[PDB]
């Protein structure tokens, strides 16, 4: 019954994204980030946008930043529903998947109403967001958020105290704090083992230092504590979304610098300067001053970062993507030691692995 060695063979979804990005302008490369961790689309966009904005030495306007936090946390709910329910579905508990994917279906509507796409929105961009929220959207997000914690409670009623669920998760895949750090874990893989770390708290970006939330911390570093952390993080996202809805400011939604963000279509059709800048931004693109940055965010699956190198032109020179699931899967052999074959399925689930980001 016992697993002695676990050798993951990946690359089955390696699509040479990093080499493709070197042939795209910075705007053209943005949609590649939707297709990495393709469960956390807008969080991937935010990371890339922050990195480019840093090299550009510009900052997006306040309303865009609140929109980016609002949809970042909606995206965390999207990811955690997937993480928890597919974790449950793969060990036989199929029903929560169906209940919660109806909730995912309604958050896909928020994606589609702001961007016109259900998943690969391409909505968060360097300089802000592509378009402002349509009238009536915040009311619908409020109505969704009002009932969501009940949906979480129903999920917990199925799993949290279930002895079968606890038997499958408790003391499975224990990770010590010191090992979690040296193996390069992040996100819940760290907090499950008691490490008090969360980039939104410690290295905040956008307006995360203006919202109140608590970081759930585990005590045993096993699959069950990581499951509890993810479920509790969903509650905190609802708590954050509640503040974003109330504190959403007025104003423009992309930086008012037409050498980076395209002008409004009405301006493009009346002003000579606007038309030139529209023409150049959609052909050459904006040039980015030479330099290199490592920019990271607390993505739903852990620390997601890009090492972005600019040579001074309108196309990136190098873009290395740091996917949290890459280091996590690299630790599968370590975590599966002394466990049974059925436990490897539970351990892969608790790592929350999407091969889009692992293989790029």
């Amino acid at each position: 019954e016992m697993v002695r060695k676990c050798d993951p063979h990946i690359g089955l979804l390696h699509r040479g994204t990093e080499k493709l990005i070197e042939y795209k302008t910075y705007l053209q490369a943005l949609p590649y980030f939707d297709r990495l961790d393709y469960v956390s689309m807008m969080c991937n966009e935010q990371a890339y946008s922050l990195a480019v904005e840093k090299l550009l030495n510009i900052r997006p306007p306040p309303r865009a930043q609140w929109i980016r936090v609002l949809f970042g946390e909606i995206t965390r709910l999207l990811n955690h529903i997937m993480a928890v329910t597919t974790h449950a579905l793969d060990i036989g508990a199929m029903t929560p998947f169906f209940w919660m994917f109806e909730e995912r279906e309604k958050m896909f509507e928020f994606y589609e109403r702001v961007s016109g796409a259900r998943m690969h929105a391409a909505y968060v961009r360097p300089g802000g967001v592509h378009q402002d929220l349509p009238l009536g959207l915040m009311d619908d997000i409020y109505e969704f958020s009002k009932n969501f914690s009940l949906r979480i409670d129903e999920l917990e009623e199925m799993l949290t105290n279930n002895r079968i669920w606890r038997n499958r998760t408790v003391d499975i895949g224990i990770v010590t704090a010191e090992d979690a750090l040296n193996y390069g874990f992040s996100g819940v893989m760290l907090r499950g083992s008691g490490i008090q770390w969360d980039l939104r708290k410690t290295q905040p970006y956008d307006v995360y230092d203006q919202v109140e939330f608590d970081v759930p911390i585990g005590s045993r570093g096993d699959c069950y504590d990581r499951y509890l952390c993810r479920v509790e993080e969903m509650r905190q996202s609802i708590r954050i979304i509640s503040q974003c809805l109330n504190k959403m400011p007025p104003g423009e939604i992309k930086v008012d610098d037409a050498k980076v963000s395209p002008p409004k279509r009405a301006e493009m059709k009346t002003s000579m300067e606007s038309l030139i800048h529209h023409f150049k931004l959609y052909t050459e693109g904006y040039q980015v001053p030479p330099g290199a940055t490592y920019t990271a965010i607390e993505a739903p699956k852990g620390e997601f970062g890009v090492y972005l190198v600019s040579d001074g032109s309108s196309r990136p020179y190098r873009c290395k993507i740091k996917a949290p699931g890459f280091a996590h899967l690299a630790g599968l052999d370590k975590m599966s030691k002394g466990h049974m074959l059925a436990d490897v399925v539970a351990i892969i689930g608790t790592q929350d692995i999407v091969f889009g980001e692992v293989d790029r």
């Binding site: 610098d257 037409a258 050498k259 002008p263 301006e267 059709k269 009346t270 002003s271 000579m272 300067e273 606007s274 038309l275 030139i276 800048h277 023409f279 150049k280 052909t283 050459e284």
Partner: protein, 263 residues
């Protein structure tokens, strides 16, 4: 020992007498923006895009025409220089037409590119624009004179390089127009070169019209065989087809010109 010492943003450069401020900046690798100036044409000094601040001088000078003086410190990036460029670019674009999508120069336009690098990002011009009649000067050079920025490069080329005095300016002020006054074809064996020197889409290749955008072409540096001069050329191709022929600078052969047959 005739060289004098001048400074470009504080860096010393030794230049021979008669060197202009613009040429002094070239020596340290700084390219002053320009429209009217062309190094193979007579100095004109009319576009004012090359205006630059001299340290301690209250007035900006036209870098393309001003001889540099011993001890001058040329500030190519001071707020005074940058505000002069923004002001001039604003005047150039006030009456310019919103033609970039339909204009062949788009993508390789010095007005577009210098507007991006040295101009403002928005307009505060709230009036109607000038519109100009088009002039027919033959089957090689199309004219869209509403795009003309009155840099007079074509006039100086036709007079000095081609030895033809058919191009001039008529009228005065904002209605000043480049053209031939009468209905006349600028048929010279070097006529096609006024397409290259014209910084905007006012003069464009009629055979080339609408067929390609500059970014999508591949450049093959080659040689002309239409005569025995051996003019250096760039052959523009796209998706396996020849699109146009352009000059390639060779100081000892064709400089930066080609004949109309070559072109």
């Amino acid at each position: 020992s005739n060289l004098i010492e001048v400074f470009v943003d504080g860096q010393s450069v030794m230049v021979e007498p008669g060197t202009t401020v613009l040429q002094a900046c070239e020596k340290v690798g700084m390219q002053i923006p320009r429209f009217c100036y062309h190094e193979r044409l007579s100095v004109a000094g009319n576009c004012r895009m090359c205006l630059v601040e001299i340290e301690k001088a209250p007035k900006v000078v036209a870098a393309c025409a001003m001889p540099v003086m011993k001890g001058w410190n040329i500030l190519t990036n001071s707020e005074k220089t940058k505000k002069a460029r923004e002001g001039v670019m604003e005047f150039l674009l006030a009456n310019h037409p919103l033609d970039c999508p339909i204009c062949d120069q788009g993508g390789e336009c010095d007005l577009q590119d210098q507007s991006m690098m040295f101009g403002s990002d928005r307009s505060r011009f709230l009036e109607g624009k000038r519109a100009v009649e088009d002039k027919n000067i033959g089957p090689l050079v199309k004219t869209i004179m509403t795009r003309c920025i009155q840099c007079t490069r074509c006039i100086r080329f036709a007079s000095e390089i081609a030895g033809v005095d058919d191009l001039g300016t008529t009228g005065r002020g904002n209605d000043m127009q480049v053209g031939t006054y009468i209905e006349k074809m600028f048929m010279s064996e070097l006529s096609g070169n006024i397409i290259d020197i014209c910084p905007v889409g006012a003069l464009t290749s009629k055979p080339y019209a609408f067929t390609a955008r500059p970014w999508e072409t591949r450049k093959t540096e080659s040689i002309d065989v239409m005569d025995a001069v051996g003019s250096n050329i760039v052959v523009s191709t796209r998706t396996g087809e020849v699109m146009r022929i352009l000059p390639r600078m060779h100081e000892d052969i064709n400089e930066e010109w080609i004949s109309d047959k070559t072109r």
